[PDB]
Amino acid sequence: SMNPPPPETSNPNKPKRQTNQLQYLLRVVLKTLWKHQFAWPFQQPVDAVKLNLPDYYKIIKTPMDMGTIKKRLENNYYWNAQECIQDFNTMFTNCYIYNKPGDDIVLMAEALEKLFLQKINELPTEE
Numbered sequence: 229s230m231n232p233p234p235p236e237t238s239n240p241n242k243p244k245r246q247t248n249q250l251q252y253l254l255r256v257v258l259k260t261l262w263k264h265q266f267a268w269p270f271q272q273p274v275d276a277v278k279l280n281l282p283d284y285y286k287i288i289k290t291p292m293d294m295g296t297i298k299k300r301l302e303n304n305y306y307w308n309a310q311e312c313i314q315d316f317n318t319m320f321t322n323c324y325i326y327n328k329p330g331d332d333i334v335l336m337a338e339a340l341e342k343l344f345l346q347k348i349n350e351l352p353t354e355e
């Protein structure tokens with residue numbers, strides 16, 4: 229019941245690239261979700277200690293959050309757009325796994341997920 233270390237946000241060994249799709253993911257997709265009213269629960273990694281959820285990291289073995297995703301884009305962690313899209317999807321999947329239907333957190337996640345899918349459908353053409 230101690231928090232795990234947050235996911236890695238910068239790796240010296242990995243090669244670094246800037247693409248329009250990556251610009252769009254940080255600049256449009258991340259920013260739109262970050263500004264949203266329901267954003268706060270997904271803005272940082274779930275703090276199991278502070279929120280007193282002992283079972284959360286036993287159930288969820290691949291934690292992800294928008295704060296982490298924002299840092300990865302900002303640190304040029306992702307070579308590919310799909311890597312970032314996968315992280316968004318993992319964050320939503322985690323919420324649904326841990327939480328029951330009708331929970332406030334699940335409803336918020338669905339709204340964010342819905343908006344995310346709309347923006348991702350507008351993803352710019354790759355190089």
Ligand SMILES: CCCc1c(C(=O)Nc2cccc(S(=O)(=O)N3CCCCCC3)c2)[nH]c(C)c1C(C)=O
Nearest residue numbers: 268269270274275278279281284322323326327333
């Ligand atoms: C049962 C919901 C728990 C949860 C959050 C969450 O963030 N909930 C939260 C609740 C209360 C306050 C704050 S908080 O942001 O205001 N806050 C101040 C309090 C103590 C430190 C923490 C930060 C955050 N997000 C996800 C994805 C989940 C789960 C389990 O799926």
